[PDB]
From Swiss-Prot, chain A:
Effect of E88D: In IMGT allele IGHM*02
Residues shown, of full length: 331 to 455 of 474
Pathology linked to this chain's protein: Agammaglobulinemia 1, autosomal recessive: A primary immunodeficiency characterized by profoundly low or absent serum antibodies and low or absent circulating B cells due to an early block of B-cell development. Affected individuals develop severe infections in the first years of life.
Disulfide bonds: C21-C83
Function text: Constant region of immunoglobulin heavy chains. Immunoglobulins, also known as antibodies, are membrane-bound or secreted glycoproteins produced by B lymphocytes. In the recognition phase of humoral immunity, the membrane-bound immunoglobulins serve as receptors which, upon binding of a specific antigen, trigger the clonal expansion and differentiation of B lymphocytes into immunoglobulins-secreting plasma cells. Secreted immunoglobulins mediate the effector phase of humoral immunity, which results in the elimination of bound antigens.
Protein name: Immunoglobulin heavy constant mu
Record organism: Homo sapiens (Human)
Ranges for domain Ig-like: 1-100
From Swiss-Prot, chain B:
Purpose: Through its N-linked glycans ensures anchoring of secretory IgA (sIgA) molecules to mucus lining the epithelial surface to neutralize extracellular pathogens. On its own (free form) may act as a non-specific microbial scavenger to prevent pathogen interaction with epithelial cells.
Source species: Homo sapiens (Human)
Subunit and partners: Either free or part of the secretory IgA (sIgA) complex that consists of two, four or five IgA monomers, and two additional non-Ig polypeptides, namely the JCHAIN and the secretory component (the proteolytic product of PIGR). Free secretory component interacts with bacterial antigens toxA of C.difficile and eaeA of E.coli.
Sites carrying sugar chains: N64, N71, N116
Protein location: Secreted
Known outcome of mutating L100T: Disrupts the interaction with pentameric IgM
Cystine connections: C21-C91, C37-C45
Domain spans labelled Ig-like V-type: 1-101
Entry protein name: Secretory component
From Swiss-Prot, chain C:
Organism taxonomic ancestry: Eukaryota, Metazoa, Chordata, Craniata, Vertebrata
Protein name, UniProt field: Immunoglobulin J chain
Any one GO MF annotation of this record: antigen binding
Keyword NADP: no
Disulfide bonds: C10-C70, C78-C101
Keywords, ordered alphabetically: Disulfide bond, Glycoprotein, Pyrrolidone carboxylic acid, Secreted, Signal
Annotated GO CC locations: blood microparticle; dimeric IgA immunoglobulin complex; extracellular exosome; extracellular region; extracellular space; monomeric IgA immunoglobulin complex; pentameric IgM immunoglobulin complex; secretory dimeric IgA immunoglobulin complex
Glycosylation sites: N46
Main localization, broad class: secreted
Residues of the full protein shown: 26 to 159 of 159
GO BP annotations, alphabetical order: adaptive immune response; antibacterial humoral response; glomerular filtration; humoral immune response; immune response; innate immune response; positive regulation of respiratory burst; protein-containing complex assembly
Domain of life: Eukaryota
Complex and partners: Part of the secretory IgA (sIgA) complex that consists of two, four or five IgA monomers, and two additional non-Ig polypeptides, namely the JCHAIN and the secretory component (the proteolytic product of PIGR). Part of the secretory IgM (sIgM) complex that consists of five IgM monomers, and two additional non-Ig polypeptides, namely the JCHAIN and the secretory component (the proteolytic product of PIGR). JCHAIN-containing IgM interacts (via CH4 domain) with FCRM (via Ig-like domain).
Intracellular or extracellular location(s): Secreted
Species assigned in the record: Homo sapiens
Record's function text: Serves to link two monomer units of either IgM or IgA. In the case of IgM, the J chain-joined dimer is a nucleating unit for the IgM pentamer, and in the case of IgA it induces dimers and/or larger polymers. It also helps to bind these immunoglobulins to secretory component.
Length: 123, 118, 104
């Protein structure tokens, strides 16, 4: 199971944000998938998902999807939205993953170079 | 930070003034530069009097500076004040560029009066 | 208000720290490690032998000095290198920095 945060393009009209609990690379089929939120499962009515689509490239394998329309602020405040997958090809048969704003944001850092500008402040 | 002196000192023109600033009595502070500098909106102390002898050209005869290592002190005497002397100053030691120093404010005002009725 | 984690007066390093107690929100504060170095680009590599090259590299394994070849003349403890004088030869002392080697 993977997970991609909503497209920044969506986060410019500031109504809704969509999240893609991509599921793939597995066999057999009949994967159920559910979305946790701090231990609280959402309703299946909150989100939508596919059926196991036969995978083109990986031959004897299936894949599916699911989405959920989190609104702008409703993603902008934390709320990691764990996505949990139920299948039979796992040791404990289950897995779950999650995301937030700050899944990336990797080390933004403003260097600064200064000369010839006496600011009247120590260093 | 380890330098210590009076924050603001006021006097009026024509008078003398004497300022004392303190340093820990260690060996170097008993045997190294003391200075009185004046800053502004231009970025830098301009030195006005030094413990090494140099006196600013505008302060010749006006003022001098003496060090009493036994008191852990150095003293600055200014006489013949004017309203052109009011501004922000600093006592300090060592190289002016660092801050082993202490900031002083100075406000000079004219000698009022002229009113025999009060 | 800061907390000087290290103040190495023979590297002129000074790692302080200060929790920026935020706007009075809950505990979404971030602690903050200020650093500061004043590298000389004037001195030797043998700080106490002015017959060596100057310096190019200035390496700060902060791990090492978060606790001896360090390269600023510390102000308070002073240095010297015995130096020959000739008036005849004599092998005699010096005082490589003043105003701190004063036996007083
Ligand atoms: C290079 O530095 C080392 C240590 O930093 C110096 O070693 C000793 O320094 C003391 C200083 O008083 C002298 O009394 C010793 O005679 C030095 N020992 C040796 C073996 O030299 C060393 O002197 C420095 N280099 C030079 C050329 O002096």
């Amino acid at each position: 199971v993977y997970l991609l945060p909503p497209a920044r393009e969506q986060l410019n009209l500031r109504e809704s944000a969509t999240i893609t609990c991509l599921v793939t690379g597995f066999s057999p089929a009949d994967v159920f998938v559910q979305w946790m939120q701090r231990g609280q499962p959402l309703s299946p009515e909150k989100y939508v998902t596919s059926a196991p689509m036969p995978e083109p490239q990986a031959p004897g394998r299936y894949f599916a999807h699911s989405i959920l329309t989190v609104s702008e602020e409703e993603w902008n405040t934390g709320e990691t939205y764990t996505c949990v997958v139920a299948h039979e090809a796992l040791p404990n048969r289950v897995t779950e993953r999650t995301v937030d704003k700050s899944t990336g944001k990797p080390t933004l850092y403003n260097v600064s170079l200064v000369m010839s500008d006496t600011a009247g402040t120590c260093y | 930070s380890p330098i210590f002196g009076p924050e603001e000192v006021n006097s009026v023109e024509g008078n003398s003034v004497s300022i004392t600033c303190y340093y820990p009595p260690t060996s170097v502070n008993r045997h190294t530069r003391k200075y009185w500098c004046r800053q502004g909106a231009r970025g830098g102390c301009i030195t006005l009097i030094s413990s090494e002898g140099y006196v600013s050209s505008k302060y010749a005869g006006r003022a001098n500076l003496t060090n009493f290592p036994e008191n852990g002190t150095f003293v600055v005497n200014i006489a013949q004040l004017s309203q052109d002397d009011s501004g922000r100053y600093k006592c300090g030691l060592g190289i002016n560029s660092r801050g082993l120093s202490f900031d002083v404010s100075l406000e000079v005002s004219q000698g009022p009066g002229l009113l025999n009725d009060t | 208000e800061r907390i000087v984690l290290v103040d190495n007066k023979c590297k002129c390093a000074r790692i302080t720290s200060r929790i920026i107690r935020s706007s009075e929100d809950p505990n979404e504060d971030i602690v903050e490690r200020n650093i500061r170095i004043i590298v000389p680009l004037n001195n030797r590599e043998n700080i106490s032998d002015p017959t060596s090259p100057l310096r190019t590299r200035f390496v700060y394994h902060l791990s090492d000095l978060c606790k001896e070849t360090c390269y600023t003349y510390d102000r308070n403890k002073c240095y010297t290198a015995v130096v020959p004088l000739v008036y005849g030869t004599k092998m005699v002392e010096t005082a490589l920095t003043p105003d701190a080697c004063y036996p007083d």
